[PDB]
Design a protein around this ligand. Structure first.
Ligand SMILES: Nc1nc2c(ncn2[C@@H]2O[C@H](COP(=O)(O)OP(=O)(O)OP(=O)(O)O)[C@@H](O)[C@H]2O)c(=O)[nH]1
Ligand SMILES: [Mg+2]
Lengths: 179, 179, 173
């Protein structure tokens, strides 16, 4: 029962960004609740929690990259310094939906310099796998024939595609780095 | 709308030219010509809002497109390329719209404030026009949109007030007096 | 073609330096970088009676960047007091500048210049500018930003120094 209820609460709160955009503390509380639900093993809850989060990010993108009252650092930072501890239990597709969600936040930081730093760290995790697979391919190109490494190159790219859909043009700094 | 598009086209053409070859480029036909479309564009925008007589309609239609077109453009410009008249143009609209714009100070001050402040916080000489204007703006906001200074966090507010101290320490009579 | 020593004085931000630059370079300085002490600048105008040279002693207006203040004036042959119509304070101190100057130079053609006429919101109405009258100084309204009455101060001083009321600038090689 609790999961069916929690989902509806999360659906309702997801439909009123106007209210979230006026009440940071609540927004904050909601986002964190979603981050917790992201390790929930009950059926569907993780799909629910991701849908809501991307929804909210899209609609409240600016509040995550600008410092709110009662804080001394933009929420994105906490989120970025923890990506792994949050998404560790998510499935492949859900991880992409998560990356797309943060991508929208990044797209809010119009300030060149800072957006660039945000972007570099945003793509830091996926980049490690990439950089790794790449150096080994520069020793034996038979590796790009390895089932597992090809499965990863797929997922890395898939992640790169979502980030780009949300970040927009500025994402060029990333594309150029691996193009 | 289109006029804003071309304004932004030129504003990005100029900044690049400068970023690629230093201030010097400003001192030649084409650039000075492109500066002119920008400046008259700003004259037109501010020149009308001044003699307008329906604040809300003006704040809900002719103001939001200014954000991405003129403000975030002024933000993304290289220091040498930013148009000082952007600040003074905005100052005039605050004087006119007043309370009807008090809710957009957040969005505006973001783009221009801090980034402009870093151009005028090293000494008391460089970027004269930017000094003068910036404080006509800050004057206006404080004068007709004070509530804004309360909405923002104590950390941001402080940064504002200390900026004022900075004003009245100037040796340029006008800047220090405005402070 | 002999020359002359011209001492330029006034408050800070008055536009003394800016005025001088305009003449030699033709450019207009928008920034305010206060002059420390003095900066001798030779200026040349070509008249119908041979070239003429002014050694502009652009002094400082600020009190802490003063220098050998009254010490610069010695041996002067003409002067220019300048104030800013946007700041009354700089007109109320004019008497102080004329003071120091004549205590060093008893009788030399002087000119009083109200700079910044171009700025629409003028805080020093012409009705108030009367100090030159009883001290028998010449006066002009000027703007280094628009070249308004740009060469009046110098043209007048030339009339006096060369003892010719019909001297005219021409800019002949
Ligand atoms: N609008 C306007 N501004 C002027 C005019 N003349 C000078 N200024 C500005 O006023 C300031 C005056 O600067 P300076 O020429 O260095 O003044 P100053 O008399 O040399 O000051 P000190 O060297 O300290 O004695 C500069 O910022 C100029 O850009 C003018 O005619 N019109
Ligand atoms: Mg000087």
């Amino acid at each position: 029962n609790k999961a069916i209820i929690a989902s509806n609460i999360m659906y309702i709160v997801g439909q009123y960004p106007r209210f979230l955009r006026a009440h940071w503390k609540f927004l904050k509380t909601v986002v964190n609740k979603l981050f917790e639900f992201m390790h929930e093993t009950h059926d569907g809850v993780q799909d629910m929690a991701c849908d809501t989060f991307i929804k909210i990010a899209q609609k409240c993108r600016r509040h995550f990259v600008q410092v709110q009252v009662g804080e001394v650092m933009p929420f994105i930072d906490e989120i970025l310094n923890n990506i792994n501890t949050i998404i560790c239990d998510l499935q492949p597709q859900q991880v992409h939906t998560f990356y797309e969600a943060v991508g929208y936040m990044i797209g809010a930081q119009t300030d060149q310099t800072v957006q660039e730093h945000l972007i570099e760290k945003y793509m830091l995790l996926p980049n490690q796998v990439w950089d790794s697979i790449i150096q080994q391919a520069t020793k034996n190109v038979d590796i790009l024939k390895d089932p597992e490494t090809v499965k990863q190159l797929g997922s890395i790219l898939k992640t790169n595609v979502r980030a780009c859909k949300a970040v927009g043009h500025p994402f060029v700094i990333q594309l150029g780095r691996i193009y | 709308l289109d006029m804003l598009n071309v304004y932004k086209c030129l504003s990005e053409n100029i900044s690049a030219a400068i970023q690629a070859n230093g201030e010097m480029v400003t001192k030649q036909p084409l650039i000075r010509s492109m500066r002119t479309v920008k400046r008259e564009t700003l004259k037109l925008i501010s020149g009308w809002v001044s003699r307008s007589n329906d604040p809300q309609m003006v704040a809900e239609n002719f103001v939001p497109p200014l954000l991405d077109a003129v403000l975030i453009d002024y933000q993304r410009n290289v220091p040498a390329a930013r148009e000082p008249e952007v600040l003074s143009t905005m100052a005039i609209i605050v004087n006119k719209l007043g309370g009807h714009i008090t809710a957009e100070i957040p969005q505006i001050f973001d783009a221009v404030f801090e980034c402009t402040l870093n151009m005028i916080n090293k000494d008391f000489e460089e970027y004269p026009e930017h000094r003068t204007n910036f404080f006509l703006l800050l004057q206006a906001v404080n004068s007709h949109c004070f509530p804004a200074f309360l909405a923002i966090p104590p950390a941001q507010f402080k940064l504002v007030l200390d900026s004022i101290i900075w004003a009245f320490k100037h040796t340029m009579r006008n800047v220090a007096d405005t402070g | 073609q002999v020359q002359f020593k011209l001492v330029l004085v006034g408050d800070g931000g008055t536009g003394k330096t800016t005025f001088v630059k305009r003449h030699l370079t033709g450019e207009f300085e928008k920034k305010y970088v206060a002059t420390l002490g003095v900066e001798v600048h030779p200026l040349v105008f070509h008249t119908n009676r041979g070239p003429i040279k002014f050694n502009v002693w652009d002094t400082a207006g600020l009190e802490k960047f003063g220098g050998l203040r009254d010490g610069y004036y010695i041996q002067a042959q003409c002067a220019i007091i300048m104030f800013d119509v946007t700041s009354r304070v700089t007109y109320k101190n004019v008497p102080n500048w004329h003071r120091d100057l004549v205590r060093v130079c008893e009788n030399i053609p002087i000119v009083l210049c109200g700079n910044k006429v171009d700025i629409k919101d003028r805080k020093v109405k012409a009705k108030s500018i009367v100090f030159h009258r009883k001290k028998n100084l010449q006066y002009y309204d000027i703007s280094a930003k628009s070249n308004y009455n740009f060469e009046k101060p110098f043209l007048w001083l030339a009339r006096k120094l060369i003892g010719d009321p019909n001297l005219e600038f021409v800019a002949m090689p």
